Amino acid sequence: AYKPQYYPGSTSVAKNRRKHMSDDVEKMRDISDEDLTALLGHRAPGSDYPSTHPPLSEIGEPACSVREVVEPTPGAAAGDRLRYVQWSDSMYNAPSVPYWRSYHAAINFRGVDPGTLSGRQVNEMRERDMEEYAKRQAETEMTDWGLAGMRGCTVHGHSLRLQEDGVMFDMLDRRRLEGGVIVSDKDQVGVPIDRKVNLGKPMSEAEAAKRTTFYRVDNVAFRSDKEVIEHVQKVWELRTKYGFVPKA
Amino acid sequence: EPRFKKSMETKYAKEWGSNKVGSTAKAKITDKKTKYLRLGYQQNPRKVEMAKCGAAITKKRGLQAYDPKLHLAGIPMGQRQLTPYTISGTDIVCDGDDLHFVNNAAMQQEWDDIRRTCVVGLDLAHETLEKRLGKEVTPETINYYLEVLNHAMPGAAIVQEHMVETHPALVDDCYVKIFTGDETLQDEVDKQFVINIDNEFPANQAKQIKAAVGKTSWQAVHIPTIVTRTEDGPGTSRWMAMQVGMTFISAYHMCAGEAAVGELAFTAKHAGLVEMGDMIPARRARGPNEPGGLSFGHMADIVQTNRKGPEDPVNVVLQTASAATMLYDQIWLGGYMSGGVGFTMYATPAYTNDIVDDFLYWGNDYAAKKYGGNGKAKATIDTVKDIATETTLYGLEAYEKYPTTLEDHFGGSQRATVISIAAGGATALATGHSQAGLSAWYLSMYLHKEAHGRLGFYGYDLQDQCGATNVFSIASDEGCIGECRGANYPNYAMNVGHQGGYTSVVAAAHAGKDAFCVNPLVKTCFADELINFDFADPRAAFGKAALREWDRCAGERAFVIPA
Amino acid sequence: AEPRFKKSMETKYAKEWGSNKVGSTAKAKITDKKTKYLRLGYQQNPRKVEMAKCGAAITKKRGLQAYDPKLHLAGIPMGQRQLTPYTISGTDIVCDGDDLHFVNNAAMQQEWDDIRRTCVVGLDLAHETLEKRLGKEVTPETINYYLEVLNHAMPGAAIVQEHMVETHPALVDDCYVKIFTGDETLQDEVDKQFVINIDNEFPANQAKQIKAAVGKTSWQAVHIPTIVTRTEDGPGTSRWMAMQVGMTFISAYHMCAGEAAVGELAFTAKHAGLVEMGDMIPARRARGPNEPGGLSFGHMADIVQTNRKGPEDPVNVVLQTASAATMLYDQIWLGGYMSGGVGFTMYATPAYTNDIVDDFLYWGNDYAAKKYGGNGKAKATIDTVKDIATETTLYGLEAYEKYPTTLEDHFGGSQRATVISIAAGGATALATGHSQAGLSAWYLSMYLHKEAHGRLGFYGYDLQDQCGATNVFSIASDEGCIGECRGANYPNYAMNVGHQGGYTSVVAAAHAGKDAFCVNPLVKTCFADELINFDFADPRAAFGKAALREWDRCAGERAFVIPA
Amino acid sequence: ADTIDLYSDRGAKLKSGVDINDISPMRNAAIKSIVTGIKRTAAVDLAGIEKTLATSAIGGKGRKIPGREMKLDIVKNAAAIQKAVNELVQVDSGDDTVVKALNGGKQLIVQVPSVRIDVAAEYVSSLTCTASAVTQALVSQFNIGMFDAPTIKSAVWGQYPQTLDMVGGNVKSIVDIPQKDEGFGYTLRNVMANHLAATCKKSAMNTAALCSILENTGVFEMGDAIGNQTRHRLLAFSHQGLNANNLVYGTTKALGKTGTIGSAVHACVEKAIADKVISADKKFASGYTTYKTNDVGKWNAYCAAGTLVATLINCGAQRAPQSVSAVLLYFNDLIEKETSLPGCDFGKVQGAAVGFSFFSHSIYGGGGPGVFNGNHVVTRHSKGLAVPCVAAAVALDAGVQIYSPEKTSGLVGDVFSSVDEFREPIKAVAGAV
Amino acid sequence: IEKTLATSAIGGKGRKIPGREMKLDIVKNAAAIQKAVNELVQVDSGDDTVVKALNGGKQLIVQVPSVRIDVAAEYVSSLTCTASAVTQALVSQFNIGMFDAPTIKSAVWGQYPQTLDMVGGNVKSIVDIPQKDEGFGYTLRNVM
Ligand code: F43
Ligand SMILES: C[C@@H](OP(=O)(O)O)[C@H](NC(=O)/C=C/CCCCSSCCS(=O)(=O)O)C(=O)O
Ligand SMILES: [K+]
């Protein structure tokens, strides 16, 4: 068939980037379905998924050769709302970086709407489908709950100096260290919730450095990843040349 | 030491208000960690002034106004410490709040001074008088014309009786000067009216301007600020033409309304007119003399730093970045095209804390030493790739080595703008080539994205990703020499972080080498200390107004309202 | 009875003003055909003297020639005839023409800023978006929190982020948002500080008529800062509004701060739910929305608020409308935006000074009311139009002829033609309740006037005049248009003084004392608000107070951030 | 000449060995018929005029003129009005004029005779001659007197000429007014995505094709298909918009149950390698290999097809349109990372998608996919290879958007969808070769 | 075009870009440029395209083939296809390199697309741009 190569580079950062692209990521913690739903803030934990329109089984869909061959996701078939999960990841070697959360979405999940920014990365999907994606990113090495947070608003922190306890600042204090583990007692837009979710011990600085997809000069310098730089320069050169004359 | 050492020490190792940054929250500029004291807005005297004003407004008017407690979640700003800004190249320290265009009179006046200005030829008008009426035009007739024009231009009567006039006390910022390549005319016109090219420009620059303009003559017209604020940019050439036309009637003893006056109207309003820019398309509909129509070459030529200090072309580029980024991002994109809190901090990297300055000086030193001086690097893909890559790596590593700089430029858009200004500016200065500078800007962005796994806000790199391929495209709506791109070049028409940066890249292709980038008439028009805003030193004006000490604001209604 | 202008003519031509000697040497009876020309120069007039002294000080301070009355053509300064004053119509406020130039009169500037900085924005589609996409429940309580936050944020303050720059409240105290609604429960349950209460602001018949038009729908009346509208332009208003409306929905409904539903709320605020004052105009005169060229006469008539305060005097409603509209369209728009310089103050002052147009319009209305049996009762026919227009025109012409003082005040034929046609058109529209009939009368008046005097207005005054009669009832592409929807971009009307504010008064005359609005109940209700800096219910009073430099509601100054 | 096979919207081979030049807008008879047909077509809302008049809601945007209400039984008299409009719009009896009532007489389709567009600068006679004919026909049918005629006219034409467009009027086209063009050649690119989905009755392949025909005809009018661009444009047009070689529909079907955006990227690279469009170039020490192409036009066209495949499978999976912005971005970003070759349109699809994502998920402007078009400042930047995906995505909505074609496009969709070649353009284009 | 390039007077309205001057013998090579533009503007060899050098090679008349206006919304392909054909023909005739090609393009097209029209350019019609229409049907009425 075809075996994807994903991305250049031989550094740990490049290898971690290929892990995130390919969903080859280690499960680090367990988060219950109801705890995740509580943190997301879109419905009561355990409750039925609200609908924005009727289930497809109750709708007369237009005749369309594409609809005939593209299977709806479970959330689309059910008429779920489009809801989201949004993450902020510290530039001090959080495991994830925004574009790579989006590549993880686009490569590995059907029916995604990812958005990449510097201080936030978001994915909108039919609600039940979104929860499957959110759980995977939340439970695996892609999220360190000290260096990252779930933040649907008021995201400030990715580029700020870390707190003295090593955790990334949250203006809204949705999650924090308590007894050596990260705990969270607010939903992702800052609304207090009636539970306290245990999100595990944060990674040490040394483990973050080994798992990060971020290039940082005193860990794995971007300058040292000669393959990635050569790749960038090649794509730039070809885009430039073909914009003048579109000929090999 | 890096150029931003002092500014980072001011911001992160000295008290500001009662933010405790002189004590418990003090940091070394390399520290990766800090304290979050959650003092709220009361740590910052400026915020406290704003809060007390807001509460007084609510009470006086009976309708809710500003209240920091109305932040989302009822958690007020100042959870992190609130820290200051230093105007780059200066020791002026202020709050970000002192730099919003709404709160900074010098910023408003910069835009008013552009909006209210046009350049208008004299040669076609004089030819009309000579041919149609047989009039003789001399320095004496021109001098009387200019005396009457300066009385009339602010809105005073020449011909009729029992007339209403604008009040001089409200319009003292309105006037007309002339400039000319005709050296004899330059000397015979009364000096009060003349922008003397020899006096205002170093000899080499004066020679280059005179070569471009030949023996032609021009009026530099500045209509009243109170008018430009009441009206819009398209009102400027119209106001000018009314009073030019009235003055020709009197100074040449015409019928006060004959066919020759109509040909003088077409001259002033169309054939002889140089506006700052033309109209823009319907979705963003505006007429001439608005920021969307302002080309980057015109904006670079408005800025006057190159005639005062061409020996520091990097400083020329940085001052250009300051004036242009303020206008394009704060007033235009953050005002005209959006609004609200707007885009002060997207723009402040161009003129605060010495960070972009550090990176651009570094890239220029790199390229100057390597290629044998400014302007001497060949404009090729290999030159562009080298300067852009090395400058980008320097900037990224600086943010990584100095956490204070990363925290100041907390948004990726800010960081991407800063580094691409440095990479594009260093390349343009090295090559003397605006297109090469644009190509470097885009390569920088692409490297930056891969280094950090992020770039700017959601929509930052629209133009970025179209960028490399469109530098040397010849397509209808893609091909354009850099100097003639502007805020309506299609890919550039929406987003912060770019327009003022490109203006600085265009300036970099000419700074210290040429007297102007695209228009010697615009360049010469603004070479005038009577213009309220100091286009040679925009940073100093921004800073003086940040302190509420800048004294050249025009257009107020104070004279005709109670205290 | 004596003509309505008797007092004003006595003030102008039989009482001293400054040292003009009109109280003695140059005093006249208001019917005298002759007078003296004393050639006193500008020094007879304290306002001119103040201007001359300021000009000489500017010349000296800046080293560059400024105002000097000696630079008049031939070196003969103004004031060869005596310089005489103006009385604001319906008042005892006496001032110089110089106190009424838009540049010199802060109330005139604020009238325009208050229109330019305003838009109306629906709430229903936004609430529907929240309900459908997110499943949110919208209640009076959620709306009240939304409106509290919106009034904090609209002037330019932060809601979601941290370490933010904000506009200074001291500079933006004129910016706010109110709501109005045809839903009576919502009107009661929203916090009263935010509500334009239709029942409280309008007489019961007008309130009922507004509510019938608006149904149960709900609207935001948004006024962005004056300092911003002055820095920017009219097209900036809806954009400013939409940014802060969007931010407030994010917080008030706990949305992701930037999700697809926010984008549909943006389209709602900026397009589907938006009522601007007017739209863009063509390239030759290129401007975007919320500029005077795009302002329809119906909207301008609806902005003026006299009809909700004093519908029992519909002529006064028409006259106040003529005043606010003529100032804007002739002084600021045609005499400013579209030209400039000394401009067009005196082309406009007949609409609001010396009680002359007022005399003529009261006369025409009395003629038509008596003849046809009251306002609104005359059939809209050629015969009705011909009668009212001809008799009102003859009255006005004969008045100028009987009273040389009035002819000398309205010294330009354009002024006279505007005055008489306002009277003929306004009387016809009031009699018929019909804007088209009023326009037909306006043009017949002009044609009679030209033949009577062998002159009409300035060189280009009657372009629209001569196209006028034939285009009133044309259905051609760019000619057909019901009167209320004509405006400053109707082709024939796009250039010339003396008409746009007059037509606005004719449109108002077709509705004054009969209907709550002419064309748009949303615009009408938006401006029914005493917090708006300019008093749209009594524009004449505001013009006059500001002519005396006593009007104290100017917004937008930079005083707070500059030295004394 | 390059030759392609043309396939239907469901993967049936229609024509074999077609010279790509024969699908050019400059040669294909069906493209000429569709474009000129659209220029000639206007929608009349007879029910809308009747309601506007009854409620004196003259000019829209909240307006009502008290006292000017008029009750005319327009819809009941639709047959007489159709006849009169036909006679007024035609130039000669028996010419190519079409006037038909739709939906119980609530609407008319008008197609002005061709000469009114041939001997004319642009397309607007379809709006103006229709509006004049309707206004005259109503005045005559209902014996309207002079003093009321302006009320009829403004009910039909809206606020024109105070406004540049017919604001609040009842005569519309899928094309907007020429003064709103962003630049030269943008008129045919100013058709809202929702209008296209309604015209094609939400068949995603046909919606993509109609949009691609208009976008690519626009690229020609822009002057951007001359010389060294012509083949390049025709390859990407045929491969993205006309299902050339069944690449779009066949790959969509193969990926339709389990495929993601990444699956579509990988399928495109796999097919390009198998077809010898790209081949391995430089192998780095990690094992990563860059790729080179021998045919930029063909590689670009494969990327254009793949961008649409990814849209159809990802938007189809959501049964919603909003993700199309992300699809266009990430398909192209990822294919560049996979190959070290430029993505579709050399970055311009990705760039348009960056701004489109922002302007469909933020406070600042835009909206849902349905409001975009090739003339929109946000989505204009690709040379015709982005918006056809946007329109297809809209077609796939099962009910998520507020500003859907049902809300924005009912009149024009009802009228334009009645025209077979507009609604079924793939069939038409292939039938002409 | 030749003078615009030689004086770097790119964009008109007083402009000059120092350092970007280019000396091309365009008028002397008008016959070769005519032939190349003819090949670029036509759709099929032998169609109704006209390209003719006038007045000593100082000008061309171009009439685009009818299909470029028939299968199009407006008339503007006469301007755009001509400007593109001339730009490409000059780049080819004079072997212009990539870094200079935007200079050629802006000499031909003027300030477009920063401006809506080809301000300072060298391709013109008697008709003005459709965005300047005062209303529907005014394009053929906008001839000075
Ligand atoms: C609501 C949006 C979505 C949108 O359409 N605009 C927002 C908000 C808007 C508001 C925020 C005002 C407020 O706090 O109430 C304003 C000021 C525009 C306005 N309406 O006046 C703005 N952003 Ni935003 N916005 C900014 C930025 C940013 C950065 C902030 C990252 C961080 O770590 O804090 C990110 C984008 C990114 O991640 O790259 C961002 C996103 C966002 N930006 C998210 C909210 C983020 C959050 O939930 O915290 N902005 C910046 O990167 C710096 C400049 C700063 C702007 C203010 C100024 O220039 O003075 C402001 C520009
Ligand atoms: C796109 C279009 O809006 P429309 O779709 O409503 O016509 C257009 N608006 C704009 O282009 C707006 C430009 C300025 C605002 C956005 C600048 S990018 S900086 C914001 C980034 S963040 O802080 O939110 O992350 C207009 O004409 O108003
Ligand atoms: K203004």
Numbering used by the authors:
A (entry chain F): 2 to 249
B (entry chain D): 3 to 565
C (entry chain A): 2 to 565
D (entry chain E): 2 to 434
E (entry chain B): 50 to 193
Original paper wording:
Here, we obtained the true atomic resolution structure of their methane-capturing system (Methyl-Coenzyme M Reductase, MCR), circumventing the isolation barrier by exploiting microbial enrichments of freshwater nitrate-reducing ANME-2d grown in bioreactors, and marine ANME-2c in syntrophy with bacterial partners. Methane capture, the first reaction in AOM, has been proposed to be carried out by the Methyl-Coenzyme M Reductase (MCR). In the proposed mechanism, the heterodisulfide, made of Coenzyme M (HS-CoM) and Coenzyme B (CoB-SH), would react with methane to generate methyl-S-CoM and free CoB-SH through a radical mechanism catalysed by the Ni-containing tetrapyrrole cofactor F43019,20. Despite their physiological differences, these ANMEs have extremely conserved MCR structures, similar to homologs from methanogenic Methanosarcinales, rather than the phylogenetically distant MCR of ANME-1 isolated from Black Sea mats.
X-ray crystal structures were solved for MCR from ANME-2dO and ANME-2dV, and models were refined to a final resolution of 0.98 Å. The subatomic resolution of both ANME-2d structures enables the visualisation of the majority of hydrogen atoms and accurately depicts the position of each ligand atom. However, MCR from ANME-2dV exhibits a mixture of ligands. The fit to the electron density was optimal when the model included CoM-SH, CoB-SH, the heterodisulfide, and methyl-CoM. The methyl-CoM, modelled for the first time in an experimental structure, fits a position proposed in a recent molecular dynamics simulation model by Polêto and colleagues with a S–Ni distance of 3.9 Å36. However, due to its low occupancy and the requirement for experimental validation to confirm its existence, we omitted the methyl-CoM from the final deposited model. In both ANME-2d, a canonical glutamine (position α341 in ANME-2c), proposed to be important to anchor the F430, and juxtaposed to the tyrosine coordinating the CoM thiol (position α342 in ANME-2c), is substituted by a methionine (positions α343 and α347 in ANME-2dO and ANME-2dV, respectively). The substitution does not impact the F430 position and provokes few steric displacements in the vicinity. The three studied enzymes have seven post-translational modifications, among them was a novel 3(S)-methylhistidine on the γ-chain of both ANME-2d MCRs. The location of the 3(S)-methylhistidine interacting directly with F430 suggests a compensation for the lack of the methylglutamine in ANME-2dO and ANME-2dV placed in a close proximity.
